[model samples]
Target: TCPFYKKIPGTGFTVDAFQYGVVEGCTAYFLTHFHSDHYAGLSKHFTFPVYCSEITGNLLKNKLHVQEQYIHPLPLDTECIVNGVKVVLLDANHCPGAVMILFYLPNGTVILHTGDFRADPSMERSLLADQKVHMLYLDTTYCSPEYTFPSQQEVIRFAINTAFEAVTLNPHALVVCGTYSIGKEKVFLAIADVLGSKVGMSQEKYKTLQCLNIPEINSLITTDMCSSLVHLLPMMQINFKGLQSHLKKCGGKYNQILAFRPTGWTHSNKFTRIADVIPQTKGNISIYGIPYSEHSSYLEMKRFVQWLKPQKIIPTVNVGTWKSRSTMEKYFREWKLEAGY
Candidate 1:
């Protein structure tokens, strides 16, 4: 049921297909980002040439320890010929070093593979603008109408204000934020900036953040846990039991824990406003599931489809079921019609 078109339909290049081993007939391997799902199965044994943004290349070399000889770090927005196929990398707006790969095939086909992105107004001015996309390999993470949520700015603002309010009410409350290995940097960074708090994370995570080359990131992190009220932890460790044990481990360094579990899955159309969403609290711990999504909303996808008007579209996520795939296709057709395409 896992849908991955290892080898792109017409190209000899494979995008995020290392898990399947060396795809037959593919000469080049492309990594869109550093996400586990995207970079799974890649190992030091991989002998084929790998292409990705400079940031992803660094992660591949440092984090994954993938060999340097096979890695090819490409410049963003610049066309590079790989194996005779014209390729360009555009910012995917999903995570650090994430990119939407653009391919100009010999047959004049223009294919855009959005490797997980949050569609934004700035994308309209990119090299993709004014071009007719023959086929669009889209990140359909939130393709359904019900998946619509607030903008990233609004969601970040909510998180900043909410965390500020919580910390203000109880200055001693340790503020913990759930995060992935990559992505969601804006959420925690914004919270740290507003609260004037130093972020605490494991040494391994700190090294990973260093590879991102974020400006002034060095000064924002603290090795000593006691120095920072705000802490960053893996998303899996935000539960009540996890927080309780963590608080216990702190040895009364803080009285209570106020945590944030940020993701789009927390959002529901049933809620009229973002503030209506409640937090899960038990005793001294409170976990707020904030709707901070990196993927495009349903309406954003609709707008993108309408604007791009691609002759064909292939969803990159939630394509396991015929019903789900067909549902997305139906929306695509409706949006195309509405756009008079």
Candidate 2:
């Protein structure tokens, strides 16, 4: 990557691909998940065969529709090589196929990077730990103890119950919801489970999943093609203004018009409005906020580090986007940020 491109286009954006260092023999990169924050540069630069677990690869293939020949399959804890660095993949629990990469050197030093992990309530926590992580990269998103995200199961339960009840009453009206392309398959399935139907999706979305071997999930159709009590697609960042556009068409014969959106408000006014609106639904329009999160908060990250007890910790992605505070400092009140350079 060009150093000039690091800031912006010209100043902000530049060519997608950049040259890599002389890493020696075979080099490979593994993605924690297909979320934009982590995966933005993958398809562009780093042409070398990328490694990921079957589930992660499938999610990328099915969700993000990543190009073939780019992804190389390596199960969790599976060891491989990058340049000359010995690499091992570990589950990060951030998304469906996300992993933490462990780089082992011939010397005793082992570097472990937690891409973006959460101590999950849905899946059991058995994050692979190496003997000695010389350099440990971890997620410290909500490093402040004041912040706490609820469990995924809790959110899923809320969404499922709300959706199920709404659709049962308003079967005639189309139920709309928004979800991430990478990690929403489970939620989508949950929606279908709530609806009790095979459901329908766009050609890109509802594709048959194939592998370095076989295919099974294959099938595609038009975007507007709805069948078997389908849950309609709702644009992401969907809001009241967004719903107003389709309000007229959603009136007659329709018992309920509900829209689902998962987003964060930057301004306090919008946040307060959401606070007021989320409770008033009363089974009318199902707005599901199943706490399926990608980033780990202060306490979760602390628990992770305590579990691993790594000597050295490193932050890979920009500390600004997430809080600059680490699980160690924020939880312990040991570090301070100075204007956040």
Candidate 3:
């Protein structure tokens, strides 16, 4: 479980569950979202009772084919009893159906699992009346100080506007966007709707987007650049070889190809940093990597700990690599000190 999973001490249940442990011993499971890294060992044949948002449940049934009986659907903002513990699901400002779990134990301990989410002030405001949190299981994906960027919505607006600006200048060119299959569907949808042009993707991605069921997001399946004004390809398509291949396949059917990537990693100092509204252009492609991330950044994470004031912070993902004594001690002490815990 890599120190991220929180087993209820002696109880067999786990929240934001992992499948690496025993199925029978796994009394209950809670799924925060459908991200692959979050559900590492989970499969369609999972045996234990799994709890998730209704959207996530539908994805599990239609997408993963997990039986409906094993899937327990929980609505947001509602508290339900699971194995004698009070559980509530809060909307996470990430992908659709993503949630932050708040669990109240039998012994009066409150444990919060921020599965994978970006900061949303309203989410915190909803918890003001709750008891003080005893433990917090955090999503520290961008825990390093180097990460600094604007909010998800802010970045989305910027990226969409930037793409439009680039398209306006190069009317005859093909604008290509790089994104994951699920997380960044908003970017593609906005571009398709705003530009009044159909986007193109592979059949696999088309099938995945079908579950989203938004009429405005329907796209044809093909890599043929001439078929659509904007091309939606996997994030890996940003590299030199992939770009060259895509351009080569086009056979100069278009005037130029403009590439833009919306991601959080672009905030790193290793890359050429630009202003909030600007983009980076190298070669024939223009790239814009925004701070749109599912997990909180270093500054946001600190703010979260300060706002929640949890007694102890537990790392969820990336714990395996950052498990050294100095690293662990430094993180554990530094977080508390920063938050005045």
Query: Largest lDDT belongs to which candidate?
Result: 1
Model 3 regions lying over 4 Å from their true place: 1-4, 21-24, 213-227, 247-253, 266-273, 276-288, 321-340
The lDDT of each candidate is: 0.86, 0.52, 0.71
**Lowest-sum lDDT 10-residue window in model 2:** 7-16
TM-score of each: 0.95, 0.70, 0.84
Ranking by lDDT: 1, 3, 2
Looking at candidate 3, the ten consecutive residues that score lowest on lDDT are 216-225
- State the lDDT of candidate 2 residue by residue for 1-341, as single tens digits: 33321211111111112233322333344556656655555533345665667876776565556676786777776667655556677667665667766666666576666766775433224435326555666665555555555555655676677668767765675555565455544555566667766545455544432322222233222244445344445455355555445444443545555666543222332234322335325333444443456667555665556655566565554454444544344543332122121
Q: Scored by Cα lDDT, where does model 2 land?
A: 0.52
Better of 1 and 2 by lDDT: 1
Candidate 3, 300: how far from true, in Å? Answer: 1.3
**Residues 1-341, candidate 3, lDDT per residue (tens digit)?**
42435665545567655646664466788888887766767777787898888878877888788998899998788879988778889987778778988888788888888888886556667863567998888777777777776665666676678768767887766777887746766776676666767788776666666665455443533444467777877889876567768877776876666676776666363454435345556577555555566767777777767788887777776676646434645766777786676
Best by TM-score: 1
Candidate 2 TM-score over all chains jointly:
0.70
